[PDB]
Amino acid sequence: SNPYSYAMSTEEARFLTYHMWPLTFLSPSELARAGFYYIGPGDRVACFACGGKLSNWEPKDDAMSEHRRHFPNCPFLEN
């Protein structure tokens, strides 16, 4: 059995959840590559593997860096 979101297991599936994404400085592509799909409202995203949620993204933020900073034990980051 699978403890992760099978639905959001592919980069492609995560990418396809973004519609009218409000930030010009952080792309749906970058977020999907870092394991994040759109949950909202606003700029809130969730990891398919650890279930970590992040919002209030800053221009300086790197999605993979923030994933590791906030959710260091995430199994997606390790494999």
**Residue 25 or 68 having the CB closest to Zn ion:** 68
Cα separations in angstroms, 10 against 33, 35, 48:
9, 8, 9
- Closest separation between CB of residue 52 and Zn ion, Å? 5
Contacts of 11 (CB under 8 A, 6+ apart): 32, 33
Q: Given the complex with Zn ion, which of 58 and 78 has the nearer CB atom?
A: 78
Q: Quick check: helix, strand or coil at residue 58?
A: coil
Q: How far is the CB of 59 from Zn ion (least distance, A)?
A: 22
Three-class DSSP category at 42: coil
Tokens of 22: 């409000």
Q: Give the nearest distance from C-beta 17 to Zn ion in angstroms.
A: 15
Pick the closer one to Zn ion by CB: 8 or 47.
47
Residues that bind Zn ion (CB under 5 A): 47, 49-50, 52, 71, 74, 76
